[model samples]
Target: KLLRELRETQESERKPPPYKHIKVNKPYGKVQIYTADISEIPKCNCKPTDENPCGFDSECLNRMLMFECHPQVCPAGEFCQNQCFTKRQYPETKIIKTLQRGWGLVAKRDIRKGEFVNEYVGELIDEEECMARIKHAHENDITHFYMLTIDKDRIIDAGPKGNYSRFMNHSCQPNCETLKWTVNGDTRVGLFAVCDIPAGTELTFNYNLDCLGNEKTVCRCGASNCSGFLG
Candidate 1:
């Protein structure tokens, strides 16, 4: 009993603090997860025109381009309007072992809807390099893949170096989502809380697989509506 108590004490000490300030940079770095007081949304510096309706609201443009105006590209502008949201971070979080999943992320405190969780950081590589890494992993029988497709030109492989987001498991019914946004004219991805998440709840997102018609991996998420496949 004494040994168990001592071990538990050591483990507790190793755990992250109840809250830790996390910050991230574009294309690389660990994402920050701290809070700030509410503030007004700043306007963008781009000039308004007939073609560019949202002069200072890149968020507005992003929404339109994503939903209403599919394939309609945003005009060249100074910077993204919703840069602040991309920069905003959330409460404390940590990684822990799971019963089925090798590792998973859990909330250390209640996370509100639309809060920034973390940035998926990794070595930015091109398609050729990405394919090489995947082939290498396949040849070695390494199952855990960490490649994130940011766009047609860039792919992020976090297998070698990455932040906690890499450990996030997949769920058919998830509490979070991965979103893409333009940061200083560069495309970046961030994990956001889709709904209010309670403390100690494991965080997950749908890993929307592409072009996987028949190939699939067995899923052990244990969700009531589990699709039984990870792919």
Candidate 2:
């Protein structure tokens, strides 16, 4: 019985979680998963020189260095030669409930200012679908909204399912910022640390929720510069 149980435990450990198996649109690469102890930093093709810094922001050769940037055509060092990129893995994170803010995400280790903490992953939906979900949630009184607008047309809805990123709360003086990256033809959102974060520090970003409505959620981040309300 002991031997059988050991084998079963090993088998269970080998199976990847549902979050690790998420698939993106055809052009974008597969979801990258991180365990609690490992970190994966993204590599940049940027060879920053005086001749052309950041590869002509006009035409922008920087886009070529993205993870999903033309996988079939650009494939690693083929076309992406001059660009800066963010590292995309945060292995030291855990979820904890805050005093009045409900659940929140925090870093378990010291994080540098420019590190890529994580990517916002969810079910990709259209603009109409996004509106419908928000409407339905409002009618049903489900208040914790996790829908993020990625571009003019695409929206990532994490209300039903998502990783720890959904637990990140809003702060007026945020320690992190969200930026968009082009992964092949698809638009991807990356959360980057804007300042050095000490271990055990809670992670936050400005929701910038100005267009929602006249009423806004109250901010409880406890920062001295709290914006009074989360928008």
Candidate 3:
């Protein structure tokens, strides 16, 4: 019996979990992203709890290089996520698309300002694991993106399924803003329509981090409201 049980345990250990890949649509506040773990999760490199945000500059060798930027306060009922590009299908027309970026939810039609664009949902991750993943991702330029928000001490996983929405680039004058939904004091994220987006336009949000004075990083997002560095 002992030998049989050992054999069964080994077999179970070797078996990989079943994975599924499917396209998802956004609802009023529910965003369809993420799976269980690396194998089951969608093909993405984003974690919802990174401390630093990643930059999409082409010429810069160290896009994730921490910089100093000015500070601005996030308005009430609004919160910050680290730097991110909403998912995208076309990156060419957009300046950041030169990186072969992925597809994100753009305004399929005329989306009104303050409308719900989409959301991000995933499993809660341990704080240490979340930081480790961000560090690992930072080493690779093709996959380098830091936290989009510091909603909690833990992180949310956006599994790696090769979703194009993961490649949405940053915009200074962002049309979409990052919003979060917390359950039991945990962070749940979704994008909100900050302004109406034209059909075929890419959606984006800012990495609202703590920045102060020349210690702040410069923002290339080009949004008139760009706070230099996410403050």
Candidate 4:
């Protein structure tokens, strides 16, 4: 299974899960002015038998800039280390409940410092539509926002449909963080561990300060130096 079902409670069993889970990501809503240089594919120059093929060492340019090499053109091919996203290399993780908060993710296996965890899978939406949805949600007093800013005039909204990454909460001092990388001429946001994350650790990432403008929320992050609030 890509991601297992949520650990639903008796109260939540009757109500539906927060969002519809998806295996992969896709665009949503009407078309808009969106352009990506899919033609400029990045290639890694590593010999097929190289020990550190496309890794941080051995002069791998793609890994230097956090970009995955084009899987088809890589000299290392199947053995390429920079093809994490292209190969969909993710560690096992489980969604669990947070008594204080709502829901969150827990690492099921040991995730190394530089290893990939999961992708922030969701729907790509235009800025106008994203803002309209945000405004409507606020008007209706909806608190949960599973949306994240992907690019200019673009948002990777996981509210309607998303993967387990949507359950990850905010933490200033988090064991996990999101990293942007180019894979097969496409931009993807994947979850990575800031440090070696042990099994059963709850995953979190910084919202990068001041996410919600007017409607702010308090933080119970349980960090030694808590930010006192979350946006």
Candidate 5:
């Protein structure tokens, strides 16, 4: 019994705080889950051939509106381009420890501009739960907040549960950006490269003025356009 307890303690100490792995957004804190109607799914017409498949470019009607094209729904059929949702296609990246930033993510391969990087995921909660969690974190003396606002009424709390995307830092002069798109008929946020990124380069994005809780924090990204603070 004592040996088991000691082993558990040692295991917990390795990661310090254990994070629950989740690939998709989960409804928590009694947050109501809303599903999109069939009528809301956007359709795109793309000429698909053996040489040219759906390019998943701005020319994609559904992609332009931030809506994913379902395989059967898109005219491209099996050559659908907006299948990132089910395919889980993302650029190669890895989590790493940062010198000043709490954590960071680095590209493992050359990433093209406009390439999808990672999905921001966590527990989907309502505004009431969001405020409560923030207040609790403040009382607990946690310096960083992991609550991402999906909208004024919805939020994604990544404190207790999160994916590698949570390790991404913020920069005023960003090479990456966040795009809110619909996947599987539900809204989702994904990080993408705004500029071509070389392997070993760190990924970053602006957290937005209203991204964080309470206020901002000093930024050490060292970019020329550094805003000096991150929120």
Candidate 6:
């Protein structure tokens, strides 16, 4: 019992405090369990007693996060890493729209429920680079920075295009869903067919449970069955 109490004390000391009250919509990062707060970026408060005399350490826990310089480059026809979504309405169909917002894999024809869509292929990143972006990402940022682990040590770098799909529009009853699979030894994620998608209708899926509770944010998918903004 004494040992357990001591261990608990040490764990509590290492854990950071919740700096603020509000919630944020952090992408691909672990859901409800994690509260992404920019204000909480580590600040060193090691010595509260000492002042000018003890110039031992800096006040702020200043740490520089390094993003991948030559991040895994997406292959052609995979997804143009720089693509942006542009909205254009079809003359004949009120619902049919084409977005230039990055590369999206869609059904060639009418696909039934449980049908397989295209695969999500891109460079995998590591946890170091993954957490490195939280410093820059916004509360309601409209992008995905998906992290996949390799050998339990490294991660896959799925940029915004992956987010555009991974964090895609949602409906109360969604027709598409993201699927995680392993091809050979590499991890692959893609949108899978949850139901029959019509030829002219746009294809989309949920961004998963990361949008639940205080992490709720507005969703602009415009589906009739929209969940009144993803929550």
Candidate whose lDDT is highest: 5
C-alpha lDDT of residue 117 in model 5: 86
TM-score computed on alpha carbons, candidate 3: 0.45
Q: What digit string (tens of lDDT, one per residue) describes model 1 on residues 1-231?
A: 995896466433345223222344324333222232223222232333434344222346444332211112324343233333343444678889776676789989998887677777766666766677677767776667767777664776666666677778888788988877655345567788899999999999887542111134678888899888766
lDDT of 2 at 170: 80
lDDT of 2 at 73: 39
lDDT of 5 at 12: 19
lDDT score at residue 130, model 4, on the 0-100 scale: 80
lDDT of each: 0.60, 0.59, 0.40, 0.74, 0.77, 0.38
The CA root-mean-square deviation of candidate 3, after full C-alpha superposition on the true structure, stands at: 19.3
* Candidate 1 global CA lDDT score: 0.60
TM-score order of candidates, top first: 5, 4, 2, 1, 3, 6
Top model number, TM-score: 5
Model 2 per-residue lDDT tens digits across residues 1-231: 996896566422232124432333211223332222112223444443423433324233444444432322332444343222223345469877676766788988898885677777777666776677778877876657777777654667665566677778888888988877755334577777999999888898888741132135777778898768776
lDDT of 5 by residue, 47-138 (tens): 66534455655477777777877776777788877777557787777777776786678988998898888888888889988888788877
The best-first sequence of candidates by lDDT reads 5, 4, 1, 2, 3, 6
lDDT of 2 at 112: 83
Worst 10 residues of 4 by lDDT: 1-10
Q: Ten-residue segment with the worst summed lDDT in candidate 2?
A: 32-41
| Candidate 5 lowest-lDDT run of ten | 7-16
Q: Which residue runs of candidate 6 sit more than 4 Å off their true CA positions?
A: 1-108, 139-157, 160-168, 210-216, 223-231
Name the lDDT value of residue 209 in candidate 5: 38
Single out the weakest 10-residue window by summed lDDT for candidate 3.
68-77
Please write out the lDDT profile of model 6 over residues 113-141, one tens digit for every residue: 75445433334444555556543554445
How many Å off is the CA of 208 in candidate 2? 0.9
**Model 6 TM-score?**
0.42
